[PDB]
Design a protein around this ligand. Structure first.
Ligand code: HEM
Ligand SMILES: O=C(CCCCn1ccnc1)N[C@@H](Cc1ccccc1)C(=O)O
Length: 452
């Protein structure tokens, strides 16, 4: 009874994801098959959920817990039992959860703001300093910004991305390791000697990341500056339940986890937000008007960022259309029936296909493809589990407020400081990595010539 997309013999559905854009492939499948489809691969089955109707059940934490998708399982080879790749039942998940949640308290957020502004100003300055007719490589610069922000705010580490015309080596290795991790989904015989080089490159890339992590830790140890940041909590915070701090190994995984998680989807969000803004000039103008009205100081204060309501709406609407961490996986904690209709056995896996959730016309109306920030004029109007860019429940994104604050600040500053032109009439082309990004999205920015 459950729809299932086309199969490939013994490979079952797995070749469907042998594409550069698997999330978009799954969205198309969802478009065809509806709110739920079974997806089989050799030795694996999951069910992709796309309707709020079913996802609200899936989001019942008494019935389902976070599952490590194959992607996360393979990413776990270097993210280990960091927060994102740990099972809820692993001691280190709840420990690190409890230890690191304070890093995203309101007070923490205020504390990050200055460094977020530091990086944002670097972005603005970069764009201010472009010559006539030069253009902005949007995902690239958003990723420079987000990486630097998480590095600086989180770890008091400067990736100095705006000093580089190429991504920081960490990124290069992180991108290749993520990609290798996700390529393993397709690999029938992962121990085939043909993948020895992939294994070597994987370890080399993991070593690059870990070397940077070791440097972040050593620099913090050696530091004479007082820090009270995410790393501080990693190195010193004690879990109230266990009384225990994170052990060294987990700290390292958390650093890797947060460097990755703390920058990748946010960069996508910013990129998509700017994409949608330049595609929707009335929206852009409204957002710009808000930025101009609110950001009355040379650098935004924390409170001003919080007053960028419409910018927040823009970001939420971008997350609605292109949630940059576009899926998460769940497993049935016990036998349960989904939707009154689909019996699941304990351990059965679900995938929540967030972009498709966000296109559930029964929630959003028929105009789901339109970019309408006003959908979020009162976010509380959105039904529960209808809008899930940050995942669910206690396994939701710990960094959501950081992401949104950063993105609101940055977008606000961008909108305050520049007019943007979609000079190429850019054709959305969504590159799928760990996140989604509008690949090749370029704009031209005309400074409003507002000093910092
Ligand atoms: C707009 C940007 C972001 C989006 C869309 C996003 C999305 C998500 C989603 C969907 C999950 C759940 C994944 C799952 O259940 O498998 C998640 C978890 C997580 N995110 Fe984010 N995220 C963003 C930014 C960030 C930031 C800025 C940080 C850290 C500073 C971060 C750190 C994490 C961590 C550590 C987890 C795992 C939480 C846990 O399981 O304990 N993310 N994110
Ligand atoms: O589920 C995840 C992993 C989601 C990670 C989201 N994310 C980002 C940051 N934090 C969490 N991919 C999806 C889509 C997919 C399928 C095959 C190959 C690659 C991708 C799936 O396997 O169905």
């Amino acid at each position: 009874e459950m729809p299932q997309p086309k199969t490939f013999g013994e490979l079952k559905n797995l070749p469907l994801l042998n594409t550069d854009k698997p999330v978009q492939a799954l969205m198309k499948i969802a478009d065809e098959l509806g709110e739920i489809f079974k997806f089989e691969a050799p030795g694996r089955v999951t069910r992709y959920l796309s309707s709020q109707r079913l996802i609200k059940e899936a989001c019942d934490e008494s019935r389902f817990d976070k599952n490590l998708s194959q992607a996360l399982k393979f990413i776990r080879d270097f993210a280990g039992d960091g927060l994102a790749t740990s099972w809820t039942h692993e001691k280190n998940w709840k420990k690190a959860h409890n230890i690191l949640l304070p890093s995203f308290s309101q007070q923490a957020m205020k504390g990050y703001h200055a460094m977020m502004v530091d990086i944002a100003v670097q972005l603005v300055q970069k764009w201010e300093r472009l010559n006539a007719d030069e253009h902005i490589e949007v995902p690239e610069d958003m990723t420079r910004l987000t990486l630097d922000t998480i590095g600086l705010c989180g770890f008091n580490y400067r990736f100095n991305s705006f000093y580089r015309d190429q991504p920081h080596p960490f990124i290069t290795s992180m991108v290749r390791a993520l990609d290798e991790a996700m390529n393993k989904l397709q690999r029938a015989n992962p121990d085939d000697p043909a993948y020895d080089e992939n294994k070597r490159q994987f370890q080399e890339d993991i070593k690059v990341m870990n070397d940077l992590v070791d440097k972040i830790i050593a620099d913090r140890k050696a530091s004479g500056e007082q820090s009270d940041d995410l790393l501080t909590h990693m190195l010193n915070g004690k879990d109230p339940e266990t009384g225990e701090p994170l052990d060294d190994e987990n700290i390292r995984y958390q650093i890797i986890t947060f460097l990755i998680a703390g920058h990748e989807p946010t960069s996508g969000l910013l990129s998509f937000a700017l994409y949608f803004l330049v595609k929707n000039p009335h929206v852009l103008q409204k957002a710009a008007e808000e930025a101009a009205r609110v950001l009355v100081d040379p650098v935004p204060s924390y409170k001003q960022v919080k007053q960028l309501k419409y910018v927040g709406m823009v970001l939420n609407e971008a997350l609605r259309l292109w949630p940059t961490a576009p899926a998460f996986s769940l497993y049935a904690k016990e036998d349960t029936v989904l939707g009154g209709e689909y019996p699941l056995e304990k351990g059965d896996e679900l995938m929540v296909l967030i972009p498709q959730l966000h296109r559930d016309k029964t929630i959003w109306g028929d105009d789901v493809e339109e970019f309408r920030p006003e959908r979020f004029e009162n976010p509380s109007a959105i039904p529960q589990h209808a809008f899930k860019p940050f995942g669910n429940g206690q396994r939701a994104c710990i960094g959501q407020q950081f992401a949104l604050h950063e993105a609101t600040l940055v977008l606000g500053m961008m909108l305050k400081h520049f007019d943007f032109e979609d000079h190429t009439n850019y054709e959305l082309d969504i590159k799928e990595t760990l996140t989604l990004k509008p690949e090749g999205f370029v704009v031209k920015a005309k400074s409003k010539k507002i000093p910092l």
